[PDB]
Amino acid sequence: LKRVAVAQLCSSADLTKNLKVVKELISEAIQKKADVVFLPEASDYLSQNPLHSRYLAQKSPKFIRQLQSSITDLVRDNSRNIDVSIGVHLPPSEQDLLEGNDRVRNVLLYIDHEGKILQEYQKLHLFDVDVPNGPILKESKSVQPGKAIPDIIESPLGKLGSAICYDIRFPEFSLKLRSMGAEILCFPSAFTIKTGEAHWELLGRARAVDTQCYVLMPGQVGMHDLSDPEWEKQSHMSALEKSSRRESWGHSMVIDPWGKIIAHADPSTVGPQLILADLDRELLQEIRNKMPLWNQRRDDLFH
Amino acid sequence: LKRVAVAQLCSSADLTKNLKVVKELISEAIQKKADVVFLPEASDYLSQNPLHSRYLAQKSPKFIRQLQSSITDLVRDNSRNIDVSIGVHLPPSEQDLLEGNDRVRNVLLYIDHEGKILQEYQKLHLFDVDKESKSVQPGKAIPDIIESPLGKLGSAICYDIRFPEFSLKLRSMGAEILCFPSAFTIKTGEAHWELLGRARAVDTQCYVLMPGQVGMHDLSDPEWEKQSHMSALEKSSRRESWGHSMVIDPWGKIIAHADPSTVGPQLILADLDRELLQEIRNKMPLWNQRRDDLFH
Numbered sequence A: 001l002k003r004v005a006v007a008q009l010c011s012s013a014d015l016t017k018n019l020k021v022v023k024e025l026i027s028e029a030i031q032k033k034a035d036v037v038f039l040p041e042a043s044d045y046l047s048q049n050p051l052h053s054r055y056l057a058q059k060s061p062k063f064i065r066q067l068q069s070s071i072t073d074l075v076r077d078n079s080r081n082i083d084v085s086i087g088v089h090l091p092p093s094e095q096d097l098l099e100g101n102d103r104v105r106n107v108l109l110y111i112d113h114e115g116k117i118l119q120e121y122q123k124l125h126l127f128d129v130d131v132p133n134g135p136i137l138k139e140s141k142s143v144q145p146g147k148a149i150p151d152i153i154e155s156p157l158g159k160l161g162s163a164i165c166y167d168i169r170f171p172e173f174s175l176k177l178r179s180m181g182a183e184i185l186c187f188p189s190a191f192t193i194k195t196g197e198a199h200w201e202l203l204g205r206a207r208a209v210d211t212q213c214y215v216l217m218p219g220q221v222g223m224h225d226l227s228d229p230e231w232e233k234q235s236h237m238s239a240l241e242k243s244s245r246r247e248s249w250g251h252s253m254v255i256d257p258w259g260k261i262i263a264h265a266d267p268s269t270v271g272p273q274l275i276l277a278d279l280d281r282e283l284l285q286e287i288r289n290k291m292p293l294w295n296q297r298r299d300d301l302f303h
Numbered sequence B: 001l002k003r004v005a006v007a008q009l010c011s012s013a014d015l016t017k018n019l020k021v022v023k024e025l026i027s028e029a030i031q032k033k034a035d036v037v038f039l040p041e042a043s044d045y046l047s048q049n050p051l052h053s054r055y056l057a058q059k060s061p062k063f064i065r066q067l068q069s070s071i072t073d074l075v076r077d078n079s080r081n082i083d084v085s086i087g088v089h090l091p092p093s094e095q096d097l098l099e100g101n102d103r104v105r106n107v108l109l110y111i112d113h114e115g116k117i118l119q120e121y122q123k124l125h126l127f128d129v130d131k132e133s134k135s136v137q138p139g140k141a142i143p144d145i146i147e148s149p150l151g152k153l154g155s156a157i158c159y160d161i162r163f164p165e166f167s168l169k170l171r172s173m174g175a176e177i178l179c180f181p182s183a184f185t186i187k188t189g190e191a192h193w194e195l196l197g198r199a200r201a202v203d204t205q206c207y208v209l210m211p212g213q214v215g216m217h218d219l220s221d222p223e224w225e226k227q228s229h230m231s232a233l234e235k236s237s238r239r240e241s242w243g244h245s246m247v248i249d250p251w252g253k254i255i256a257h258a259d260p261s262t263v264g265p266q267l268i269l270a271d272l273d274r275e276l277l278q279e280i281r282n283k284m285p286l287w288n289q290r291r292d293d294l295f296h
Helices: A015-031 A052-057 A060-080 A094-098 A165-169 A172-180 A193-211 A229-234 A281-291 B015-031 B052-058 B061-079 B094-098 B159-162 B164-172 B186-202 B221-225 B273-283
Strands: A001-006 A036-038 A085-089 A104-111 A117-122 A128-130 A136-138 A153-155 A158-164 A182-186 A214-217 A221-223 A247-249 A251-255 A261-264 A273-279 B002-008 B036-038 B083-092 B106-112 B117-124 B147-148 B150-157 B177-179 B207-210 B214-218 B237-242 B246-248 B254-257 B266-272
Touching: A001 A015, A001 A251, A015 A036, A015 A060, A015 A273, A015 B266, A052 A085, A052 A229, A060 A085, A060 A104, A104 A158, A104 B002, A117 B237, A128 A214, A128 B273, A158 A172, A158 B015, A165 A172, A165 A193, A172 A182, A172 A193, A172 B164, A182 A193, A193 A214, A193 A251, A193 B061, A193 B186, A251 A273, A251 B061, A251 B221, A273 B207, A281 B221, B002 B015, B002 B246, B015 B036, B015 B061, B052 B083, B052 B117, B052 B221, B106 B150, B106 B186, B150 B164, B177 B186, B186 B207, B186 B237, B186 B246, B246 B266
Parallel strands: A001 A036, A036 A085, A158 A182, A182 A214, B002 B036, B036 B083, B150 B177, B177 B207
Antiparallel strands: A001 A273, A085 A104, A104 A117, A128 A136, A153 A158, A214 A251, A221 A247, A251 A261, B002 B266, B083 B106, B106 B117, B147 B150, B207 B246, B214 B237, B246 B254
């Protein structure tokens, strides 16, 4: 058995305050002897609008450097290793800017116990949706889409396939990750209330059953405090344009390859929390042996 | 709104008795003003073993021809059109035999109100799980979208539901409605039946139709057993199916579902809403957002 931790949190626009929460959750994860801890999409910050996002992304590299140090400090002080998967943002590159693309990168980082970044997965499918009885959201206004399929990570838990949030709606992506050798999929997310209530548990369980993988679902939760007086000052924003009522679904969970929820967030808390699960490689292998889906595909017709 | 009927039934090894049930369900569907009725996988028969199946499949062409006549009879008697989607078996062709492929075909027929077979979909993914491929030959083709009275229909069978790329392709081809006629086991039924149907609906933004076999089957066939000189120790005449036939909207809402308290053959009805489908697709334009550059 291999122990995983999945974090649920409520990001603000304040990267210093978010880092403190992140550090506490990683610290708890090590104390509970989790081999890897998974944190949600946008754990560095959430923003008020596309201009705010670009502003905050300029602060994310320092957040990441501080996180790398915090991880190594915690590993040193606990005499125990942990790896960290965490959603952040990164500013555009020089080449991006040269091409007229000043949008931020929505990135899932994998950081090992030595503070080394092993992967930066840039989100492929961006959240451009008219929410039913809700706001029109267009992630592509602030975020640039990725151009790479993420490599399978050989983590302490097993072979890991990485995805972010709306990526979960595109089954061919999860199928590809399994085809490449994934045993575990993660979907760190900031999921809406409306689509969360409808589809969050369904999609997680569906992906698990489709791919015969463990599925980890770290989610944002609660009403986000997006306030940034210093940026609001700089942007000349009126109090009228200042309020931001973004709310995330939470219900962070761990799902087995048969679609059984084996760990789930406590609904009684809307603050940060950690859930733990023990992953069973023998169960995963048994499930795949009994129903050998990857030996039964019609590649002659599909793809 | 267009009205669909989804049938739930329990096949024996007796094609004559199965035909009677199928005809009654089609009759009931016409009475309830359904424009198309969908029946499960293996509505002609279920078999004890591969040798039994090869024997029963020889009887399937007559079943189909009699069903074709019965559909035109029922349409004409009731003075109302209906189309029929129904899972049957077909024996290997003469050419199949000469090629060494002495296996039956698991086929989904689409039969229109004129009794004409518009599609013969041969199952692509065979149920080999802890072995269908012992008796059954896999299909060679993706089925065309059918322009049905309800809208654009994509067809599949049973285990096919477990391979999301198939359903995704049918949507890419223009499906508005997907069907998964099935004989689903109890163990995987309890675990996955509702999950898989809802997932395919949400994945593809299609109405999903789930006609299932239900209950305990008796596959006894004394005449075959005598001809085969079979010992009673070798009989394998019990099967159990999950039922829970349902209709699911493009948002994953179950809008019709089999009544658990009704034993044996039953129909469920739903009125399909093309405008609802269009609204869902407009608000979350998944097919304008796929990464074909990387995946397709």
